[PDB]
Ligand binder design. Structure first.
Ligand SMILES: NC(=O)c1ccc[n+]([C@@H]2O[C@H](COP(=O)([O-])OP(=O)(O)OC[C@H]3O[C@@H](n4cnc5c(N)ncnc54)[C@H](O)[C@@H]3O)[C@@H](O)[C@H]2O)c1
Ligand SMILES: NC(=O)c1ccc[n+]([C@@H]2O[C@H](COP(=O)([O-])OP(=O)(O)OC[C@H]3O[C@@H](n4cnc5c(N)ncnc54)[C@H](O)[C@@H]3O)[C@@H](O)[C@H]2O)c1
Ligand SMILES: NC(=O)c1ccc[n+]([C@@H]2O[C@H](COP(=O)([O-])OP(=O)(O)OC[C@H]3O[C@@H](n4cnc5c(N)ncnc54)[C@H](O)[C@@H]3O)[C@@H](O)[C@H]2O)c1
Ligand SMILES: NC(=O)c1ccc[n+]([C@@H]2O[C@H](COP(=O)([O-])OP(=O)(O)OC[C@H]3O[C@@H](n4cnc5c(N)ncnc54)[C@H](O)[C@@H]3O)[C@@H](O)[C@H]2O)c1
Lengths: 257, 258, 258, 259
């Protein structure tokens, strides 16, 4: 699917991004660059994938200059840039849950900084590099959420940030189609990662107990591989005419708990 | 191979998008692909070309629920299962006034609604019932939709209403059949060169670009039946094991209808 | 007064939401309200109660396009105008197996689709033709829809499909009739205590609260037919002069269907 | 009865444009008191004096400063004895030669647009809700001004598009969380209203609007006015909308696509 492509995975040191980097390489990616802020964790992932197929770059995506450097380093080292997986994202793990009435505006600022400013800087810098290189069939994919299209009972800062990511995806797909660049998102429900266990979901039983009643599809558990497979489809020529689309991977979510 | 060992029915498989999907499903390793359709000899030609040991042709007017029952049951006992139902058959009216609201021909409305909604509903029902009987694991039902399932049209109002209805069927069936591990999704392509769009006036890739090009964000690629079949194959495979109730839009970033 | 001097037709006005809309339209100053229904005894009682100088009954099965045309003609001729068409009549199956996909009764599907999609389309068409013919300024066409026009259902799959189709009609009619200054919108209420919901087993406010209370964000108020009528009167008035193609949802923040 | 009889309303950004007209229309619909919160002191006191000092007051309030929002909300509730309507209407767009396209996104201008439109709006919803809960307000209403660009992408002003998407996420979440208190939260999404903001974008006259947007607008024979937007807001703020929450009320004349 991805033979000969060069991909960057922000947040690739952990969770969904880690699995996505592994799966992109299994799909024949020429090179996968993990861009994260967890240097030793990230280097670990890179060697696990294979030090000759995967590299790590320290990159705080909220700092546009660090994004530009990571993008430039990637294109120079590997001679191209075909896939930007804008995946890094954070939540506030606030004791009072970031409800509207208890909204911690300082914690709100942190979430919006990473999830909207960082994602926007990543889309911008990746687009600029693909255009400069004349990349053909380039793909930019943002990790979203069902909370990009419906409200939350908690984590209001996160909900607003993912709504904003969807607006960015829609706008970028409109503006970058002229260059043949496709911009899409993938919105998974609950994946066991370090993020979801900070919310109190550590085991598949925790997931089913929290969400199963609200999930239409029975008899299958959502894995990080599932999310990576959706993203590899979007990045591949199997999706050559798909842009501006939010690919939802949620088992028919009826509502949040 | 993503469809290895699966048994697929493709309605409307004698022509256009359905024909390509049947070929592409077989190329992705489907054990058997059954074309259900009403163009008897165009369809036998296709199953012939795909490989008479991989592909059969069944006469099936999808509006008739007993013919859908029969086609589904024939497929399952012949090949020992049913894993994928690609509910793709569908029509438009091709009317002098264009089926604007002002000039809606109620009789032609009835014909479009009969195939596109009653027939699609019959296929989803009969395919689902058989999957549950056989105990199919990870079954997939996929309906061909349209950007006109989520937006209004300037013309072909009956077709627009029918595709809106198909989307409601997909959403409802996903919530009801998830208990059986059956996933239900749709694929919504924009303009594919088929006999249907030829009846509309689009014969050549240059016609498509002249009618839809300025309304499409993505430049440098034309949509093909293969693209739609690849979207469906993805949805039918384990690559989409947790995707249900979803409308997979393949429109190049359609800004608006012309 | 919001609707001062306007002539309105309310289909399904003999009962439930339509009856309350007819009364509320008159309270907002409508010059004439015409109730179009198939329950003549009930409908004549509503018309007489609103006021025989202000309100008339016409027998009209909206699934028969000729009866619709006749009712619209009679309204414009009797009252010299047509400003508001509230296409509100609709039905459900009330089947013992709930019209799930697995147990979908196609003949009952046909009945629901006939009233809710074919009939609604004929009403939109015939009202639009008449307002265009009269030169109506700022005419309004409103269809009663449902949260099930935008999400799937666990039951009543035929009704879900039909209300999706109604939204496709509203969107299409909005884009085609705006050239004439005609606005087309829908209103989508959740559970109102009417003969329709009584037939689904909801007879009392406690029944509604038990079925839907914990799926509804908004507490302290129960949806009434008057709430729905006020939404329709807003959309029908100059308070909504630039609103078209819109589905006005009146559901209390519905988290999910039961 | 007047649609807003007896209600106390706050209108942020009420010194100008849509918010000024909303303040006038709310008073016209019988609001007991309208408080204009803005950062244009002389303009805002003009509006308040014009509506009538007995029924309208002005407060200086930078909505991106949560403390000033809380202070304006407390002053309203203490002065007038209640808080029934919060119309979170203040917002900005960037001054950008490059249009804030993705390719030329000025990140520091993006920051400012997000700070006012998302951080400020969130603070306004929070502080208004906290007060209505404290007061035991019955049938309270919080309305945010949104845009078609809350639900569709834009060719330009990408920062603004993301900010309005985020506002809709706030409206949806607040609706879900505040319904327990009887508080309804909705948005109103107008297309092109002639204001100082759209003049800055190059739309100064009705002909400008028609030339830029007429062929993309289904509804003919009428042009969107600020009064139309205010009437939609007044509806949502009233008992005519007693069961409407979490809803985006679109006022765009059937917009077929963005320019
Ligand atoms: N896990 C879920 O269930 C779930 C569901 C829906 C959406 N998501 C989203 O998927 C993305 C990945 O989430 P995850 O579950 O793998 O969480 P995770 O915490 O396991 O991984 C996130 C990684 O992003 C990195 N990160 C944080 N800030 C960064 C920054 N400024 N610059 C660069 N990297 C940064 C982190 O170091 C981390 O390695 C996130 O956008 C999340 O919002 C997750
Ligand atoms: N061509 C496009 O650009 C386009 C765009 C959007 C959606 N679609 C939809 O994709 C589906 C296939 O369209 P197509 O372009 O391949 O058109 P097509 O006419 O070339 O193929 C349709 C086939 O379905 C068969 N058919 C019609 N009624 C039938 C019935 N009752 N029972 C069984 N078969 C019946 C027809 O014989 C035909 O072989 C349709 O549902 C169409 O609405 C097509
Ligand atoms: N909770 C609710 O009541 C609810 C919720 C959502 C949507 N709706 C929709 O609101 C509309 C009215 O529903 P209601 O609850 O008032 O039901 P109701 O049964 O109380 O009233 C419906 C009236 O429509 C008339 N009707 C049926 N078929 C007709 C036909 N062919 N021609 C003319 N009239 C016909 C009926 O005789 C009846 O008087 C319907 O479209 C319904 O789908 C109702
Ligand atoms: N005019 C349009 O076409 C249009 C369309 C859709 C949405 N909107 C939105 O409507 C809102 C009002 O826009 P408008 O056209 O009336 O513009 P406007 O500039 O005429 O009025 C906005 C007023 O908000 C005040 N404002 C800005 N930042 C503020 C802050 N931090 N604190 C307090 N007040 C502040 C401003 O001084 C100004 O008086 C905005 O949210 C805009 O996004 C406008």
């Amino acid at each position: 699917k991805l033979e000969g492509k060069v991909a960057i995975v922000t947040g690739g040191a952990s969770g969904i991004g880690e699995t996505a980097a592994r799966i992109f390489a299994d799909h024949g990616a020429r090179a996968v660059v993990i861009a994260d802020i967890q240097s030793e964790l990230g280097r670990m992932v890179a060697e696990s994938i294979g030090a000759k197929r995967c590299s790590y770059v320290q990159c705080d995506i909220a700092d546009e200059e660090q994004v530009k450097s990571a993008v430039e380093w990637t294109a120079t080292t590997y001679g191209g840039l075909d896939v930007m997986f804008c995946n890094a994202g954070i939540m506030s793990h606030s004791d009072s849950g970031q409800t509207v009435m208890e909204l911690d505006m300082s914690k709100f600022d942190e979430v919006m900084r990473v999830n909207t400013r960082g994602t926007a800087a990543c889309v911008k810098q990746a687009a600029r590099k693909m255009v400069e290189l004349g990349t053909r069939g380039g793909a930019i994919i943002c990790t979203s959420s069902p909370l990009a299209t419906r409200g939350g009972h908690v984590d209001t800062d996160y909900v607003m940030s993912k709504h904003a990511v969807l607006g960015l995806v829609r706008s970028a797909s409109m503006q970058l189609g002229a260059h043949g660049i496709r911009v899409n998102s993938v919105s998974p429900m609950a994946v066991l990662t370090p993020l979801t266990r900070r919310m109190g979901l550590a085991t598949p039983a925790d997931v089913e107990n929290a969400l199963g009643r609200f999930t239409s599809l029975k008899g299958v558990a959502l894995t990080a591989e599932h999310v990576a497979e959706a993203a590899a489809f979007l990045a591949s020529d199997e999706a050559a005419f798909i842009t501006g689309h939010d690919l939802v991977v949620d088992g028919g979510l009826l509502c949040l708990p």
